[PDB]
């Protein structure tokens, strides 16, 4: 089967959204890390 080049918009969308996810994931990781550590300590 001969492949098909995806339209640039979709390819621009996939990678732009991909990087924003890595940004958001790292962003929320360091946001939840403190409060998680605090509630872990406050539970005991």
């Amino acid at each position: 089967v001969p492949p098909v080049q995806v339209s640039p918009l979709i390819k621009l969308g996939r990678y732009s959204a991909l990087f924003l996810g890595v940004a958001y994931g790292a962003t929320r990781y360091n946001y939840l890390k403190p409060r998680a550590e605090e509630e872990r300590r406050i539970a005991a």
């Binding site: 918009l9 958001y24 994931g25 890390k33 550590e37």
Partner: protein
């Protein structure tokens, strides 16, 4: 095996900096269809189709999320 990369080199590639004007070209087309509101000509068959590729790129965003957190099953914390 290797045929994946054979196809990946076509569709699974970071877009070259030369085709980004074509990307905003279709980007301005879709916003033009929204300004006039002509999306009502779009019979539901392709309407679901664009909705599917919309969910796809949405999934790429969530794929970017799980790799941005160094965790798969939610947030490890």
């Amino acid at each position: 095996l290797a045929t994946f990369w054979y196809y990946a080199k076509v569709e699974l590639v970071p877009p070259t900096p030369a085709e980004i004007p074509r990307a905003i070209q279709s980007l301005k087309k879709i916003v033009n269809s929204a300004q006039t509101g002509s999306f009502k000509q779009l019979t539901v068959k392709e309407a679901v189709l664009n909705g599917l590729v919309a969910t796809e790129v949405l999934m790429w965003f969530y794929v970017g999320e799980i790799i941005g957190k160094r965790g798969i099953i939610g947030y490890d914390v």
